[PDB]
Paper text:
The structure of DsbA is comprised of a thioredoxin domain with an inserted helical domain. Adjacent to the active site is a hydrophobic groove which serves as a site for both DsbB and unfolded substrates to form a complex.
As the crystal structure of the p-anisidine analogue 16 showed that the installation of the p-methoxy group induced a shift of the benzofuran core away from His32 (relative to anilino 15), the m-methoxy substituted phenyl ether 26 was synthesised to observe whether the shift could be avoided. The co-structure showed a horizontal rotation relative to the unsubstituted phenoxy 25 (comparable to 16) but notably a less pronounced shift into the left-hand side of the binding groove, meaning the π-stacking interaction between the benzofuran core and His32 could be better retained. This suggests that 26 may not engage any polar interactions with DsbA despite its close proximity to the polar residues His32 and Gln35. Adding functional groups (16 and 26) or extending the ring linker increased the heavy atom count but did not contribute to binding affinity; therefore, leading to less efficient binders.
Author numbering: 1 to 188
Write the structure that this text describes.
Amino acid sequence: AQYEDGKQYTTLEKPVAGAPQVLEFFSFFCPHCYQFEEVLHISDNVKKKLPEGVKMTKYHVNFMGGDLGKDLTQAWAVAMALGVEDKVTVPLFEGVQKTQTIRSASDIRDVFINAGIKGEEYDAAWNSFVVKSLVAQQEKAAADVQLRGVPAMFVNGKYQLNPQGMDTSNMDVFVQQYADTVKYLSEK
Ligand SMILES: COc1cccc(Oc2ccc3c(CC(=O)O)coc3c2)c1
């Protein structure tokens, strides 16, 4: 078969009941995740191959970056709560991995301020229980699949993308294979 379990994807031994349709995990510390966002634009190319309105979910993880990694999961919860993911993803990636100007929770806040989020608005969200709940959600989703590495994408809580089984000589061909595999899995 053109798509087969163990090749472009694997099948979770313990399916996760009631998981998002398309669930992506990343870390702002993760070098491949940097490539996935700035160079390959995986999330956008998956979205363009799914039916309009389909829910794509992207969550941050704690297991990279120690203390600052946990701060970044909370800041991503702030980003999701405020709807400003598209405003802070690039400057957070570049702050952690390119310029290395993000060394504290205050430096993370600076990124939001520079992106136009008001300080009182950021601080109110940071300390809110809605954000605490969004942190819990991100952690639970990762725990549900015993997540030990990123980037990762899961489809319907049953299938995990396997990008190691794809040619990488051409960046554009790899992206479309990835997105076509998500589409195929979403139609299973
Ligand atoms: C410029 O960046 C690119 C572009 C195209 C292909 C490519 O190849 C990859 C991408 C991600 C991963 C992972 C994910 C992990 O396990 O961290 C494992 O092997 C990988 C191989 C990298």
